């Protein structure tokens, strides 16, 4: 009951899941073979949320892996915990999107996306009571940008009343990995806002800043950064799998964080995060956890949190801890920064408590705050986009696949609309 399916795409998105399941599998005690070897009786109270059942007793994540090139698709299985997936769910083409959005949204993806929706429909119809879907796609890559975005548009068209979630990584300016990054970003938001119920941004820049300062590990690796995004994945649905004082389903977080329909962009963080050595010393208590929760450096997005003002915030504490110390602390952080909290929404902090602590820590906190500061991220992406477009550079590729130059102008206007009106509520007062 109220279970969720998962479908992931793109090498960035596919790699994200290849670590998320490993992390999620550990919590319930599901070993790679799929045979039960758990420890706590509570480990299996609510396995239906993420796991189906199969004859013979081996479990299979409700994952539909999609990518337009077979090179990576044949890689995720071979990794650790890589064979929990039903290979029947796999779907892929034979050519490769080539970071060409039009290729991944009009020509190729349209050809293969008929099959992909088929497996999704079968998985969705199999659940007892459907709740929503969650995506893990990267906006810097074509197939994820185009094929990833197109799937949401259709999927919302079959299940208009169910919730949705998307994990996206936008390209920060200090580090660049795709020369065509600016183009696919502007078109992507043009379609994610109109249909996605919830979407949150995580930037490569933030990972590198967070990794090099607190953890201070000298040699980060793609395995490392994927871990932080792993904990955040599980930071939003903990109450769906274990008993808690204040359960807050995925829908519940939706109602309390979106004041108006067109603003559904969130930025996340995690804690505690202690250096490798200094863990034996820190004092893990509500006062200590709270301060590291709202710090600028911990946040996962390049936007400086103080450059804007918090429209709303969410907090889901983990494990056993007195509510009073939780309740009192939230109010305290709502006056020591009285200016940064918009003044026409009184009592603008939400708190949830769960009683099953994540393995590896005696306590934990997951942060989800809708900070108006995100205007910085979209503004700069507009700056890079405009420069490359007035000279009509790199556009002949897209125009060759049935697309017209008019469509790009429409998309650009829409993005400026969201940025322009997003700050509207920043200056309005009572």
């Amino acid at each position: 009951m109220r279970e969720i399916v998962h479908i992931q795409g793109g090498q960035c998105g596919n790699q994200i899941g290849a670590k998320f399941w490993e992390v999620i599998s550990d919590e319930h005690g599901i070993d790679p073979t799929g045979t039960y070897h758990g420890d706590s009786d509570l480990q299996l109270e609510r396995i239906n949320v993420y796991y189906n059942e199969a004859t013979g007793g081996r479990y299979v994540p409700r994952a539909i892996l999609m990518d337009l090139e077979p090179g990576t698709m044949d890689s995720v299985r071979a990794g650790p915990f890589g064979q929990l997936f039903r290979p029947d769910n796999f779907v892929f083409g034979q050519t490769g999107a080539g970071n060409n959005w039009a290729k991944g949204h009009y020509t190729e993806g349209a050809e293969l996306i008929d099959s992909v929706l088929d497996v999704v429909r079968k998985e969705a119809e199999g659940c007892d009571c459907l709740q929503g879907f969650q995506i893990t796609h990267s906006l810097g890559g074509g197939t994820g940008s185009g094929m990833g975005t197109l799937l949401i548009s259709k999927v919302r068209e079959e299940y208009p009343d169910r919730i949705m979630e998307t994990f996206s990584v936008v390209p920060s300016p200090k580090v660049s990995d795709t020369v065509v990054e600016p183009y696919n970003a502007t078109l992507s938001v043009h379609q994610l806002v109109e249909n996605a119920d919830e979407c949150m941004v995580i930037d490569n820049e933030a990972l590198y800043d967070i990794c090099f300062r607190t953890l201070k590990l000298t040699t980060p690796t793609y395995g490392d950064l994927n871990h932080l995004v792993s904990a955040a994945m599980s930071g939003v649905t903990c109450c769906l799998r274990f008993p808690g004082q204040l359960n807050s389903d995925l829908r519940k977080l939706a109602v309390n964080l979106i004041p108006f329909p067109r603003l559904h962009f969130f930025m996340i963080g995690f804690a505690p995060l202690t250096s490798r050595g200094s863990q034996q010393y820190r004092a893990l208590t509500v006062p200590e956890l709270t301060q590291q929760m709202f710090d600028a450096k911990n946040m996962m997005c390049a936007a400086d949190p103080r450059h804007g003002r918090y429209l709303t915030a969410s907090a889901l504490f983990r494990g056993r801890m007195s509510t009073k110390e939780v309740d009192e602390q939230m109010l305290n952080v709502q006056n020591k920064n009285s200016s940064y909290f918009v003044e026409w929404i009184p009592n603008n902090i939400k708190s949830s408590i769960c009683d099953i602590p994540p393995k590896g820590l005696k306590m934990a906190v997951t942060f989800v705050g809708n900070s108006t500061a995100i205007q910085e991220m979209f503004k700069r992406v507009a700056e890079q986009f405009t420069a490359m477009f007035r000279r009509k550079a790199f556009l002949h590729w897209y125009t060759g696949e049935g697309m017209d130059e008019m469509e790009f102008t429409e998309a650009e206007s829409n993005m400026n609309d969201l940025v322009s009106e997003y700050q509207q509520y920043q200056d309005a007062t009572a």
């Binding site: 108006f260 322009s420 009106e421 509207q424």
Partner: protein, 188 residues
Amino acid sequence: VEINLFKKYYDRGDLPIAVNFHGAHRKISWKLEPELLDYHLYLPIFFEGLRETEEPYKFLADQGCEELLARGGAKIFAVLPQLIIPIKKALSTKSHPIMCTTLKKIQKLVTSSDMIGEALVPYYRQILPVMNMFKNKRLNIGDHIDYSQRKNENLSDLIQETLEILEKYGGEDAYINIKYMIPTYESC
């Protein structure tokens, strides 16, 4: 753009209009009769002129854009797609005097010819947003009577009547879309 598209176009010598005013205040006598002109190539150019704030381009753009839709007949519907992106910039100038100029022009557009508003509903997400900027900002004087009603300078008053016109001719679907942009609106 570095220069308003209107100014460059006029100086060349291809606009068919001139001032030649001899009367009460001012008037415009078109070098050629209106019906012959093509609306596709000219109609959006004039709308680019609304943005102009240095004379004489301000008025000389204004008077026509009111005039074009008055005697259009039925050809206006062809140009509806072409009028979206220009006008979007017009409302973004944030200048108080302009919004008074363009808002009346847009309001009169819907009533110019029949079966046009139904076409304009899908483009609400472009023209509606800035309209929310100043909905609540209005004069609060009190009992003392207002001397300024003669010329429409009240931003709040001008806009409020604007939506009313949009929904009456918008059609059945008009109401739902209008709310999704500006929430405070109340059905009529």
